[PDB]
Write an enzyme that holds these catalytic residues in place. Structure first.
Site, PDB file in Angstrom:
ATOM      1  N   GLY A  14       0.791  -1.221   0.000  1.00  0.00           N
ATOM      2  CA  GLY A  14       0.000   0.000   0.000  1.00  0.00           C
ATOM      3  C   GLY A  14       0.820   1.266   0.000  1.00  0.00           C
ATOM      4  O   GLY A  14       2.044   1.228  -0.021  1.00  0.00           O
ATOM      5  N   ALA A  15       0.112   2.386   0.011  1.00  0.00           N
ATOM      6  CA  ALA A  15       0.693   3.712   0.142  1.00  0.00           C
ATOM      7  C   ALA A  15      -0.107   4.489   1.180  1.00  0.00           C
ATOM      8  O   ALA A  15      -1.342   4.538   1.119  1.00  0.00           O
ATOM      9  CB  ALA A  15       0.652   4.437  -1.190  1.00  0.00           C
ATOM     10  N   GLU A  17      -0.129   8.188   3.954  1.00  0.00           N
ATOM     11  CA  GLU A  17       0.096   9.634   3.912  1.00  0.00           C
ATOM     12  C   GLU A  17       1.585  10.016   3.897  1.00  0.00           C
ATOM     13  O   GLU A  17       1.972  10.972   3.226  1.00  0.00           O
ATOM     14  CB  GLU A  17      -0.616  10.290   5.102  1.00  0.00           C
ATOM     15  CG  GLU A  17      -0.702  11.797   5.037  1.00  0.00           C
ATOM     16  CD  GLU A  17      -1.423  12.386   6.234  1.00  0.00           C
ATOM     17  OE1 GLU A  17      -1.341  13.629   6.421  1.00  0.00           O
ATOM     18  OE2 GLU A  17      -2.055  11.609   6.994  1.00  0.00           O
ATOM     19  N   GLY A  19       4.236   7.540   3.473  1.00  0.00           N
ATOM     20  CA  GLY A  19       5.094   6.552   2.812  1.00  0.00           C
ATOM     21  C   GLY A  19       4.416   5.224   2.550  1.00  0.00           C
ATOM     22  O   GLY A  19       3.189   5.152   2.457  1.00  0.00           O
ATOM     23  N   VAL A  21       3.229   1.163   2.827  1.00  0.00           N
ATOM     24  CA  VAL A  21       2.717   0.192   3.787  1.00  0.00           C
ATOM     25  C   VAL A  21       3.132  -1.173   3.300  1.00  0.00           C
ATOM     26  O   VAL A  21       2.869  -1.521   2.146  1.00  0.00           O
ATOM     27  CB  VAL A  21       1.188   0.259   3.937  1.00  0.00           C
ATOM     28  CG1 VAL A  21       0.743  -0.596   5.146  1.00  0.00           C
ATOM     29  CG2 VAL A  21       0.749   1.693   4.110  1.00  0.00           C
ATOM     30  N   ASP A 128     -13.206  10.801  12.083  1.00  0.00           N
ATOM     31  CA  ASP A 128     -12.937  10.342  10.712  1.00  0.00           C
ATOM     32  C   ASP A 128     -13.423   8.889  10.503  1.00  0.00           C
ATOM     33  O   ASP A 128     -12.782   8.091   9.806  1.00  0.00           O
ATOM     34  CB  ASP A 128     -11.443  10.490  10.398  1.00  0.00           C
ATOM     35  CG  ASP A 128     -11.133  10.437   8.905  1.00  0.00           C
ATOM     36  OD1 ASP A 128     -12.058  10.572   8.076  1.00  0.00           O
ATOM     37  OD2 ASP A 128      -9.943  10.250   8.560  1.00  0.00           O
ATOM     38  N   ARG A 132     -13.392   3.281   4.754  1.00  0.00           N
ATOM     39  CA  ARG A 132     -12.002   3.301   4.356  1.00  0.00           C
ATOM     40  C   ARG A 132     -11.040   3.259   5.533  1.00  0.00           C
ATOM     41  O   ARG A 132      -9.883   2.904   5.339  1.00  0.00           O
ATOM     42  CB  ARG A 132     -11.690   4.509   3.473  1.00  0.00           C
ATOM     43  CG  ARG A 132     -11.829   5.853   4.171  1.00  0.00           C
ATOM     44  CD  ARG A 132     -11.647   7.017   3.211  1.00  0.00           C
ATOM     45  NE  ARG A 132     -11.680   8.264   3.971  1.00  0.00           N
ATOM     46  CZ  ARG A 132     -12.794   8.884   4.361  1.00  0.00           C
ATOM     47  NH1 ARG A 132     -13.978   8.403   4.024  1.00  0.00           N
ATOM     48  NH2 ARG A 132     -12.736  10.004   5.076  1.00  0.00           N
ATOM     49  N   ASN A 133     -11.521   3.608   6.735  1.00  0.00           N
ATOM     50  CA  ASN A 133     -10.680   3.637   7.947  1.00  0.00           C
ATOM     51  C   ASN A 133     -10.880   2.434   8.874  1.00  0.00           C
ATOM     52  O   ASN A 133     -10.402   2.424  10.010  1.00  0.00           O
ATOM     53  CB  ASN A 133     -10.873   4.990   8.669  1.00  0.00           C
ATOM     54  CG  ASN A 133     -10.289   6.153   7.863  1.00  0.00           C
ATOM     55  OD1 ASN A 133      -9.285   5.962   7.186  1.00  0.00           O
ATOM     56  ND2 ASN A 133     -10.950   7.329   7.868  1.00  0.00           N
ATOM     57  N   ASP A 146      -7.043   4.371  11.794  1.00  0.00           N
ATOM     58  CA  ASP A 146      -6.894   5.803  11.576  1.00  0.00           C
ATOM     59  C   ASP A 146      -6.890   6.642  12.829  1.00  0.00           C
ATOM     60  O   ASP A 146      -7.850   7.349  13.119  1.00  0.00           O
ATOM     61  CB  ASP A 146      -7.984   6.352  10.670  1.00  0.00           C
ATOM     62  CG  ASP A 146      -7.693   7.787  10.235  1.00  0.00           C
ATOM     63  OD1 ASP A 146      -8.537   8.703  10.471  1.00  0.00           O
ATOM     64  OD2 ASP A 146      -6.586   7.985   9.678  1.00  0.00           O
TER      65      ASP A 146
HETATM   66  C1  LIG Z   1      -3.129  -0.615   3.031  1.00  0.00           C
HETATM   67  O1  LIG Z   1      -3.410  -2.029   3.116  1.00  0.00           O
HETATM   68  C2  LIG Z   1      -3.317  -2.512   4.392  1.00  0.00           C
HETATM   69  C3  LIG Z   1      -3.075  -1.735   5.512  1.00  0.00           C
HETATM   70  C4  LIG Z   1      -2.981  -2.342   6.785  1.00  0.00           C
HETATM   71  C5  LIG Z   1      -2.709  -1.621   7.980  1.00  0.00           C
HETATM   72  N1  LIG Z   1      -2.538  -0.236   7.918  1.00  0.00           N
HETATM   73  C6  LIG Z   1      -2.103   0.548   9.006  1.00  0.00           C
HETATM   74  C7  LIG Z   1      -2.919   1.502   9.605  1.00  0.00           C
HETATM   75 CL1  LIG Z   1      -4.538   1.675   9.028  1.00  0.00          CL
HETATM   76  C8  LIG Z   1      -2.483   2.281  10.681  1.00  0.00           C
HETATM   77  C9  LIG Z   1      -1.185   2.135  11.150  1.00  0.00           C
HETATM   78  C10 LIG Z   1      -0.372   1.186  10.543  1.00  0.00           C
HETATM   79  C11 LIG Z   1      -0.824   0.389   9.485  1.00  0.00           C
HETATM   80  O2  LIG Z   1       0.148  -0.465   9.070  1.00  0.00           O
HETATM   81  C12 LIG Z   1       1.183  -0.343  10.059  1.00  0.00           C
HETATM   82  O3  LIG Z   1       0.894   0.841  10.813  1.00  0.00           O
HETATM   83  N2  LIG Z   1      -2.638  -2.297   9.148  1.00  0.00           N
HETATM   84  C13 LIG Z   1      -2.836  -3.608   9.218  1.00  0.00           C
HETATM   85  N3  LIG Z   1      -3.108  -4.321   8.136  1.00  0.00           N
HETATM   86  C14 LIG Z   1      -3.194  -3.745   6.909  1.00  0.00           C
HETATM   87  C15 LIG Z   1      -3.464  -4.505   5.754  1.00  0.00           C
HETATM   88  C16 LIG Z   1      -3.532  -3.896   4.524  1.00  0.00           C
HETATM   89  O4  LIG Z   1      -3.797  -4.562   3.368  1.00  0.00           O
HETATM   90  C17 LIG Z   1      -3.843  -5.978   3.464  1.00  0.00           C
HETATM   91  C18 LIG Z   1      -3.767  -6.490   2.014  1.00  0.00           C
HETATM   92  C19 LIG Z   1      -5.162  -6.472   1.396  1.00  0.00           C
HETATM   93  N4  LIG Z   1      -5.180  -6.890  -0.025  1.00  0.00           N
HETATM   94  C20 LIG Z   1      -5.221  -8.362  -0.159  1.00  0.00           C
HETATM   95  C21 LIG Z   1      -5.108  -8.755  -1.644  1.00  0.00           C
HETATM   96  C22 LIG Z   1      -6.240  -8.089  -2.451  1.00  0.00           C
HETATM   97  C23 LIG Z   1      -6.354  -6.581  -2.143  1.00  0.00           C
HETATM   98  C24 LIG Z   1      -6.408  -6.351  -0.616  1.00  0.00           C
END
Ligand SMILES: COc1cc2c(Nc3c(Cl)ccc4c3OCO4)ncnc2cc1OCCCN1CCCCC1
Length: 253
Positions: A14-15, A17, A19, A21, A128, A132-133, A146
């Protein structure tokens, strides 16, 4: 907080705010390895990055994202959370449009409401709350993360910057609508100003296709103009629990 040697950064996923993920592995002495999401990172911006961790670190609840730790004595600065395999709820639902049952969606909504119940009990106003959050794990457990979005925001919070758990209850109603619509955008292509004007002139979003009337009425309750009239989060959870225990209620559409 966390020794950098304990962290193995795998795939970029991911991306954010500030950098990237990434997915990775956390393995500390005396503990089994666990799967983590990793956010990698100015000073003011560094404190802005790490502030999310300090807020997140205040909480312990099954529907609030768990902070595994931070790397701040080394660089790049890092925030590690429990890995949520299905990612954000809105895009997860769009991918699975029509593919979960009403009872499954109410279970998701119940988890979100429990999280919010816990935040409000801690006197934490989110401001918020949106699909999406919210992140979703491999067992479909939804967790608030978030830590102004006009179409999610209560009219008194837009007009007067008055943000309360009752304005979060308005946002929760919008999240209910997102869920029951499988991640459609609230108010479709209406502009922000058209949304402000429509709400002030008594417009409310209609029930999504196939949405139980009892869930749409709960959304309407959350969208009362008088913030004091909106259900508090304990009443929201208790309303969903009744619907789950008595699922015949969810058949009227
Ligand atoms: C952006 O995708 C994911 C974010 C995740 C996440 N985000 C997050 C937030 Cl919101 C806040 C603080 C954080 C943080 O990561 C470390 O510090 N946290 C935990 N798990 C995440 C998982 C994410 O995506 C998982 C992959 C999903 N993907 C699977 C294959 C098809 C498309 C969807």
């Amino acid at each position: 907080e966390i020794d950098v040697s304990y962290v193995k950064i795998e795939e970029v996923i991911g991306a954010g705010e500030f950098g990237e993920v990434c997915r990775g592995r956390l393995k500390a002495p005396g503990k089994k390895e666990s799967c983590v999401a990793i956010k990698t990172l100015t000073e003011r911006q560094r404190r802005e990055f790490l502030s999310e961790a300090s807020i997140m670190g205040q909480f312990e609840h099954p529907n609030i994202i768990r902070l595994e730790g931070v790397v701040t004595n080394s660089m790049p600065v890092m925030i590690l959370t429990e890995f949520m395999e299905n990612g954000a709820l809105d895009s997860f639902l769009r991918l699975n449009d029509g593919q979960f049952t009403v009872i499954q969606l109410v279970g998701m909504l119940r988890g979100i409401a429990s999280g919010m119940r816990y935040l409000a009990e801690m006197s934490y106003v989110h401001r918020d709350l949106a699909a999406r959050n919210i992140l979703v794990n491999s067992n479909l457990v939804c967790k608030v993360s978030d830590f102004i979005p006009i179409r999610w925001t209560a009219p008194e919070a837009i007009a007067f910057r008055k943000f309360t758990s009752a304005s979060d209850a308005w946002s929760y109603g919008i999240v209910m609508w997102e869920v029951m619509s499988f991640g459609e955008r609230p108010y479709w292509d209406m502009s922000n100003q058209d949304v402000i004007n429509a709400i002030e002139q008594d417009y409310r979003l209609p029930p999504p296709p196939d949405c139980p009337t009892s869930l749409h009425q709960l959304m309407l309750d959350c969208w009362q103009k008088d913030r004091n009239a909106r259900p508090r989060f304990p009443q929201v959870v208790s309303a969903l629990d009744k619907m789950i225990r008595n699922p015949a209620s969810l058949k009227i559409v």
